Amino acid sequence: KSDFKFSNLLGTVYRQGNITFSDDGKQLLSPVGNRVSVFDLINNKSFTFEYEHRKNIAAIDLNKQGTLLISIDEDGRAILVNFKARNVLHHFNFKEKCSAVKFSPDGRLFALASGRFLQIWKTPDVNKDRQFAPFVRHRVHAGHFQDITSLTWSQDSRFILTTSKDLSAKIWSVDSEEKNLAATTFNGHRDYVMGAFFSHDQEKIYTVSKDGAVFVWEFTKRKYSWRITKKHFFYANQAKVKCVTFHPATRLLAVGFTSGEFRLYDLPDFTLIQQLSMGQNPVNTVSVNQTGEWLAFGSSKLGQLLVYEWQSESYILKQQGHFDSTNSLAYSPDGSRVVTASEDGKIKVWDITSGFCLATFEEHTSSVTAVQFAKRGQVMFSSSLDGTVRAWDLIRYRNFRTFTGTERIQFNCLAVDPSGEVVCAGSLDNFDIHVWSVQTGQLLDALSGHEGPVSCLSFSQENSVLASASWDKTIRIWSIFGRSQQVEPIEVYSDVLALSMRPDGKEVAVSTLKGQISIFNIEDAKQVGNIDCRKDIISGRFNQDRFTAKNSERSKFFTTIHYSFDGMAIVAGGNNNSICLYDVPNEVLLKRFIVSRNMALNGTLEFLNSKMRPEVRVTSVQFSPTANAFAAASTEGLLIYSTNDTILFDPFDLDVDVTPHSTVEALREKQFLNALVMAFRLNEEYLINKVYEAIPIKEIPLVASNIPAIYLPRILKFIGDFAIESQHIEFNLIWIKALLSASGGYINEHKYLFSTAMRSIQRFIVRVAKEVVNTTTDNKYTYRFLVSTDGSM
Amino acid sequence: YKLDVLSSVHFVPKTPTISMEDAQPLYMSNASSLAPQEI
Amino acid sequence: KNSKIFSPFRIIGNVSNGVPFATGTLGSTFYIVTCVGKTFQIYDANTLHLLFVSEKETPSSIVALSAHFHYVYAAYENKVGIYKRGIEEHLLELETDANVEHLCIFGDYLCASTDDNSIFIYKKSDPQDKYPSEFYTKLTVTEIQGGEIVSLQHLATYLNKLTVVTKSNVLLFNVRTGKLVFTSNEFPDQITTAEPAPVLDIIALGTVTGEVIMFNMRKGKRIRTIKIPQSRISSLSFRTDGSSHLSVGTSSGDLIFYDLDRRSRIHVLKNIHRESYGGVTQATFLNGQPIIVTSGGDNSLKEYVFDPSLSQGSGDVVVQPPRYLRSRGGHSQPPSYIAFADSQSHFMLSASKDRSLWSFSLRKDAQSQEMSQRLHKKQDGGRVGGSTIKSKFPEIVALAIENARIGEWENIITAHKDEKFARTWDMRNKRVGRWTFDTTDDGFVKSVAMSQCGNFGFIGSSNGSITIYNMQSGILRKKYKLHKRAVTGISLDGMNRKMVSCGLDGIVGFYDFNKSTLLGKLKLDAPITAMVYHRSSDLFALALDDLSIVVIDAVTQRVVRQLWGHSNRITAFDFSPEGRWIVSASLDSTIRTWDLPTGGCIDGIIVDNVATNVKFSPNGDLLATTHVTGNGICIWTNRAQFKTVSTRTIDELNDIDFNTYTSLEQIDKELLTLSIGPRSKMNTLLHLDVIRKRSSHFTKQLREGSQSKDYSSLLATLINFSPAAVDLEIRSLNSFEPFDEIVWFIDALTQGLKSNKNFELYETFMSLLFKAHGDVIHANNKNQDIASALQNWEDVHKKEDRLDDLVKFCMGVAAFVTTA
Amino acid sequence: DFEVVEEFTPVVLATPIPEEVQQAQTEIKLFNKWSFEEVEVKDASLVDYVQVRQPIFVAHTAGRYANKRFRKAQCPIIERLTNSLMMNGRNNGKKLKAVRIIKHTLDIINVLTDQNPIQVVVDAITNTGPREDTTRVGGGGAARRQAVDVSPLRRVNQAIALLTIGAREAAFRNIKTIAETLAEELINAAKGSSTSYAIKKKDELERVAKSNR
Amino acid sequence: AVPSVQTFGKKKSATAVAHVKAGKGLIKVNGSPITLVEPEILRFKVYEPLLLVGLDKFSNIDIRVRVTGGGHVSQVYAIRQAIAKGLVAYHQKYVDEQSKNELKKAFTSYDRTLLIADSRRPEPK
RNA sequence: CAGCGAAGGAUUUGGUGGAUUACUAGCUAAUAGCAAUCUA
């Protein structure tokens, strides 16, 4: 239950730093703020590393074995991570701002540009155990006079070519015996040298500067001593070079400027292969694939990330995120994608597994305040500060409906019908609730009776009663449908922000400004029970303010709460860097999550070092409708916290004779039901999978009819989280058919137990199985046409 | 932008062939996403 | 015994052990290299930060260590190791079996004295290299010439000579010619220390009766004598900043300061270190500086500074006494209890037999701080009792930290040796708290716990009664009386709903906590000594008296595992943070790891000291053990955080031993099965034209499969290559005169989807065929070969409606069951 | 065995509190006399409409029960009896007089039938409420009645109404008062004696429904 | 100098100010004890803040209530509201928060009108 | 007054030291030198 771990970070495909590819360039590693995201672009998936720098990261490299990563932040706190185990190996503090870090091509050394010293360390093994000091220093060279801007290793890991703000570039041999081969310095640029590369044969050296000159250096005679043979110029007048890279094998120089324009050249002849623009913001990063076919560009101001193949002129992806400006989120009615309403005025529909945005919608001319799904993922409603609620078909991607009032107000929250006839929206300057029909477009009603700004709205999903709650310290329940026009006001102790509604519509949980979460019975309007949450809230100290984090009244309350789908838990977040979840029977804190440890954000540290910034805040929390997770719209992105059953041995009434050995003996002796319930009492995912695949098709329905009723949600949620990605489609559908036929009355009379295990199953039937069935159906009908009709002339 | 950035609490940030069209919706590989009534 | 889960990382909390440290000087800064057992540690003397720790543990204890500029020379059992930045550069094996026990380094020479009164000289090869490396000669101090060698020094400007300080004599060797230049007269008492003065050719000798001699090593006389009666002299140091002071260090822990110019005694720092641990073991002035670094055997390293004089004209006669400056320290006695302060594995609480509670940092050793015992004020306003001569609290039996409400109120609850109340502490302030919870039955505190709401603390007395206090306000809330003998374990649920107590009468009581009922009581077969509650999985483990570990869950109150194998009393145990393993340690000098899923012993370590405490980190990072000897905390890292270990039992289905199940490729040949690959490949193939608008071997294998009537290699190549390659191979298939390549592809897809594997890909390959050149198939429809190939493709493909009505049933009934 | 200590000093206050008042902190009884546990509703379909599961100290809960439809199904049935007792033009508003005569009638119910008077009044409700009734199917005014069933809230409503107005007319000009006539009415309705106005009226309504069923 | 706490209890036009401080255990309404609060049939309406939570909460504190306005039943409802939320506020400020929200849970399970009145009315239908 | 109460108790304040981010040493013209010195 409560054992959530940080899974993913949706939104924000790039923040600051350098993009890296893999060696077999399938994944790309992107520095999001202090995490690192890794997007696998072929196997369409994505993860974010769990570890966390304390400032924004500025350098990334992983060796070409793929086996370990090193990430340096913007004051030199390096972190060495095991890339396969996903666990951090060492924390090493270089003392000043490191501009670049690079592993050697042979993997065994890495070097980095810390200030004006090039320092080469040698890589610790991944097979060795963790030591107190795993890095052993090779050397530290100081020949530059100002800060080094770039490294480049040679093809053999033998020379290293560094570029500085000082107007030179230098070549250093790795070992001392080749010191005479590499002792030259390369002058002649008017500005900062942005890059210095070898050719494929390491005979020519190209040095690209900030003003726009690329110099070709050759070991010629005018003795032989590294002349400059040709200077080529970009002649981009106002713009200047922001990032350079070179693929030496395909002779491809890729250059991004401070105007969004990037050009890519075939270098020793200097012929413009292509020139095109990311946008208007500067191109902060260029990176290239190992085969040189993909170019990943990152612009840091809008947080955007291209990877673009330059042969077939086409963008593998275009993915722009939102730093700090995200007002709301909503899970799709199957937990496959999250819709994000963001303050720059747009809707963005992010896939969860593959961490990318599918569609974006810009028809609001101001900050979109709320999104909400309806009609089972077919329609999606959003309300913004420009005065409009509007509806979005997620099939034809059209804004088909726009609802305004008559009073020119700005809407801050909405709520739709279950049977989506009516949308409803509340403002923070009008004290009314606006009730629109969705079929026609008209303003059906204006509900009046709050004496304070309507902070939150929610329709009960079962009996369709409206619950609004406002800053006049009052939650209010409106019976709209069918001749009632009934109003029931429940007073509460302080002013309310974030009401939420149970999945059965029985109760409503409100968050108040005191710091509490009160839970009320709707039909008999009396309080069922409250949680006192203002003492398990982490409220950090800002830098500008002159009052301690203990005595602050800034963020000791929750501005967004949400029920779990079994109705038993509440996740909650606010303008603080803790999100807390509770179980509402016992009113006790299950777990508290620190949403950021970035010291670049403001409200993170409670105690500031006695030796504006974007504050940290969560603006919306939601539980996943299909699989045991929650998304939180922080300032860093959409933090996705999820459990997984691979770890955490948590049995269910095992005894001493219940053992993996006992389970495989019962499987080998083919008591299949006993093996299945032994694996359920182990609650071990590999054992459940092993027994599940070992049961034959002949006796799926006998086992599925004899499964005990306490192990029913376990086998249903297992079949869901297995069958989304497993290939055994007919096996999983046979099991689903046998379970629904044998015990599908228990499910119907215990709806909210199997409310997230059944939504995960019909995330498998309509999303892989129905697509396959559509393909075979179209093949059958094209066959019947192509052989049944007359093609003659 | 500038009047509502100073009238607020929380922080607000601010020819070649193509500007790559980085922001673009409608795409789960949809081509004829029009309505049958629209057609 | 080497392990396969945990590997040794460091032993934290150690600063010194009373080997005389060495000082070294890089440029104008100073470092201080102190021995901690078998490693040394380099400290930055301007701030006492831990720069370096030696990379490997030496095979025995380091016994004499010196430091020139970049290099540190550490002598242990037989040999001298030359270390730079911790990493060992060289190892000088001596040709003896005698233990090397002194050394000096001057010039190209390293001179190492053994304990059989032989001296080994080692020489550099060429005077430009970094350390003395080659053997040169051997010197011997026989019984005629002098006693046991008590020090080995080189006083300056002495061209390749060596002052050897024996117990009675002072010899002077020429170490190039191997000669004994000068042997002094005898000394009437045994001399223990020596230090060269910054005066030219003067050494200072310290005797076992109380006198400092100032021997002039060129005249052969003694210049002056300083008498400190009944004090054995253990250190000598000289001030070198224009103030001629000497600092002697006395093995009753005293540091006495003398003016040599005006022959007075400046000041005495009394009890600067403990006499019982050796007194002041090494004291030295950082040269040119008024700061002196002392170190003692009580695991402590201090600095004292001389402020400038307070009289603006006299100065030299009004010498302000030395004051204290920075210091590092740890426990002076081996720790008795261990806990982790937080889930981040950053701080760990640690209580010792020297009656101190330290908070040690696993990230940076400067952050280690002693929790203060300065009591608060009484709540009413009455007087607090106790002695006026303040001493530390009795040594800590148990403790329990739960930082849910940290900074808010009292946070740690701790139980001391043979006293009837449990103190509280605040980890945020790092100090004691306002409350001492009584037991209310005149019994000593045998266990403590506290809930994870942070509101409640639980005291378990030796007369068998649990008392539940409030941590905020410090008052009795409830009191359960079930046991009659001593309650050794209390814990509570993560939801404050069921508590579990275990006493050494061998009954585990299960109580409801909100209601004050008991849910049950289970009688085991031995007295229970210790409980550990794994709180997420609700499984608690008991160390019984019959040397078993009983793992029992609190939900259904059954013994669910029973782990046998320990040969003596189980000292400690702890759960893995995921709750899969349990690591125990017992008085047979062993540490075992048990996989309680399978119920067997994964790994065992025979460790020479008995491990008295074992704690996992609250993440899966580290194991922390605590042994009988050694003032620190031994730290291990689990290698199973980076690899996966086999849960296969030691003594003295490889996927099921490695907890995996690689899902088999297809379960039955009559079952449809998708590809082992991404699900999106079907959609990419079916719509890759509009996707991009929004953004040969094949022919030879096809022909060879048409010969052999087996297209398995063709279909393997098709399932292998990429969507652009698939479209470009299907789009070029010779659709013109006899139509062979089309019909070979069609009955290849027939042979493919007869096999019920990769069938969504075979379906899209047929869709791509009909899309690319289904117009030529429609054109020469009624052609015999292509019509028969499509006929048998439909013959196999018409058995695909099993999937259709299967997903129709699942969709319709799932919708009906969910909605209605 | 096992015992919990949860007070650690005998509680004494400076204001002296009566011994039965400080005995009332272990169980809530109506008027500190009549226990609410082991008071069951011996007829199902009326449990969840006669409410005896939140014990009270006096029949004067000033809560608001007339602003949703079935919210008066969880007013405690002693207070519903009290509120129905304070109705006519003479005795409107006088809830303290109604509470005082409810206290007197429960005292004399217990002194006549030595059993729990809350159990007696709950049995009187569940025996009085009619289980069938007739509506007048109109046809423009064709005088024909059709038997309908009757919902449990209407059964509890009409039960309290029949009992209270039977006590009024039984106390109309006899020597007995409203408290004594209501006691006789609740006792006879509890045992179901057919000597009460209330269950004679129930038997007439049910018999007419049986007639023109 | 003393830890003290002031709360308010209101029904229609009665209003009751309750001062709670540490003491010996005396509960006094309008100077007279709590066992004199007429109309004597609603004395248990006044008592139920004491009997719902036990007199061991009141064994260490002394309350005084000053009640003006209203009528008989409005004054007993003001008294019980003032006593209840005064005990809650005292255990908030000077005793632990766990006993604070245990008291809030007990009073709210009995009736939350001990802690929150029904104040602004009517409804214009 | 009672009570609390070990060769005393309370309040206030100045200075210094250690933490307030996760520990790979100083200098320079830096593949090494110096640190007693870079200069003939």
PDB file of N, CA and C in Angstrom, chain C residues 367-387:
ATOM      1  N   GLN C 367      30.703  16.843  10.720  1.00  0.00           N
ATOM      2  CA  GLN C 367      29.357  17.002  11.244  1.00  0.00           C
ATOM      3  C   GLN C 367      29.058  16.120  12.440  1.00  0.00           C
ATOM      4  N   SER C 368      30.000  15.302  12.886  1.00  0.00           N
ATOM      5  CA  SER C 368      29.769  14.447  14.033  1.00  0.00           C
ATOM      6  C   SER C 368      29.828  15.272  15.301  1.00  0.00           C
ATOM      7  N   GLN C 369      28.814  15.132  16.144  1.00  0.00           N
ATOM      8  CA  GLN C 369      28.643  16.017  17.287  1.00  0.00           C
ATOM      9  C   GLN C 369      28.108  15.243  18.475  1.00  0.00           C
ATOM     10  N   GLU C 370      28.576  15.577  19.668  1.00  0.00           N
ATOM     11  CA  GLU C 370      28.085  14.900  20.854  1.00  0.00           C
ATOM     12  C   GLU C 370      26.774  15.522  21.275  1.00  0.00           C
ATOM     13  N   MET C 371      25.740  14.702  21.428  1.00  0.00           N
ATOM     14  CA  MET C 371      24.481  15.188  21.960  1.00  0.00           C
ATOM     15  C   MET C 371      24.679  15.649  23.392  1.00  0.00           C
ATOM     16  N   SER C 372      24.245  16.864  23.676  1.00  0.00           N
ATOM     17  CA  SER C 372      24.525  17.488  24.952  1.00  0.00           C
ATOM     18  C   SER C 372      23.581  16.999  26.031  1.00  0.00           C
ATOM     19  N   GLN C 373      24.089  16.955  27.255  1.00  0.00           N
ATOM     20  CA  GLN C 373      23.327  16.483  28.397  1.00  0.00           C
ATOM     21  C   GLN C 373      22.992  17.605  29.362  1.00  0.00           C
ATOM     22  N   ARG C 374      22.948  18.836  28.883  1.00  0.00           N
ATOM     23  CA  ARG C 374      22.625  19.977  29.722  1.00  0.00           C
ATOM     24  C   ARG C 374      21.121  20.023  29.909  1.00  0.00           C
ATOM     25  N   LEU C 375      20.662  19.791  31.133  1.00  0.00           N
ATOM     26  CA  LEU C 375      19.246  19.609  31.398  1.00  0.00           C
ATOM     27  C   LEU C 375      18.484  20.919  31.245  1.00  0.00           C
ATOM     28  N   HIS C 376      17.184  20.796  31.006  1.00  0.00           N
ATOM     29  CA  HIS C 376      16.308  21.952  30.878  1.00  0.00           C
ATOM     30  C   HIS C 376      15.931  22.463  32.265  1.00  0.00           C
ATOM     31  N   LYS C 377      14.963  23.361  32.331  1.00  0.00           N
ATOM     32  CA  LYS C 377      14.427  23.761  33.619  1.00  0.00           C
ATOM     33  C   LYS C 377      13.237  22.889  33.974  1.00  0.00           C
ATOM     34  N   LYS C 378      12.993  22.756  35.270  1.00  0.00           N
ATOM     35  CA  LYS C 378      11.825  22.030  35.738  1.00  0.00           C
ATOM     36  C   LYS C 378      10.558  22.780  35.353  1.00  0.00           C
ATOM     37  N   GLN C 379       9.492  22.017  35.115  1.00  0.00           N
ATOM     38  CA  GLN C 379       8.303  22.587  34.499  1.00  0.00           C
ATOM     39  C   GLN C 379       7.515  23.437  35.480  1.00  0.00           C
ATOM     40  N   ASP C 380       7.421  23.002  36.735  1.00  0.00           N
ATOM     41  CA  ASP C 380       6.697  23.791  37.725  1.00  0.00           C
ATOM     42  C   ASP C 380       7.532  24.959  38.229  1.00  0.00           C
ATOM     43  N   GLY C 381       8.823  24.745  38.448  1.00  0.00           N
ATOM     44  CA  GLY C 381       9.669  25.783  38.990  1.00  0.00           C
ATOM     45  C   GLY C 381      10.411  25.332  40.228  1.00  0.00           C
ATOM     46  N   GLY C 382      10.235  24.070  40.606  1.00  0.00           N
ATOM     47  CA  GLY C 382      10.970  23.508  41.713  1.00  0.00           C
ATOM     48  C   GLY C 382      12.394  23.191  41.323  1.00  0.00           C
ATOM     49  N   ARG C 383      13.174  22.776  42.312  1.00  0.00           N
ATOM     50  CA  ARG C 383      14.564  22.437  42.073  1.00  0.00           C
ATOM     51  C   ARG C 383      14.678  21.020  41.553  1.00  0.00           C
ATOM     52  N   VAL C 384      15.688  20.797  40.762  1.00  0.00           N
ATOM     53  CA  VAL C 384      16.028  19.467  40.281  1.00  0.00           C
ATOM     54  C   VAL C 384      17.075  18.906  41.223  1.00  0.00           C
ATOM     55  N   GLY C 385      17.043  17.602  41.458  1.00  0.00           N
ATOM     56  CA  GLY C 385      17.990  17.012  42.379  1.00  0.00           C
ATOM     57  C   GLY C 385      19.378  16.806  41.811  1.00  0.00           C
ATOM     58  N   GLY C 386      19.993  15.678  42.139  1.00  0.00           N
ATOM     59  CA  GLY C 386      21.250  15.293  41.540  1.00  0.00           C
ATOM     60  C   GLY C 386      22.451  15.911  42.221  1.00  0.00           C
ATOM     61  N   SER C 387      23.619  15.390  41.863  1.00  0.00           N
ATOM     62  CA  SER C 387      24.866  15.881  42.421  1.00  0.00           C
ATOM     63  C   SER C 387      25.233  17.220  41.816  1.00  0.00           C
TER      64      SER C 387
END
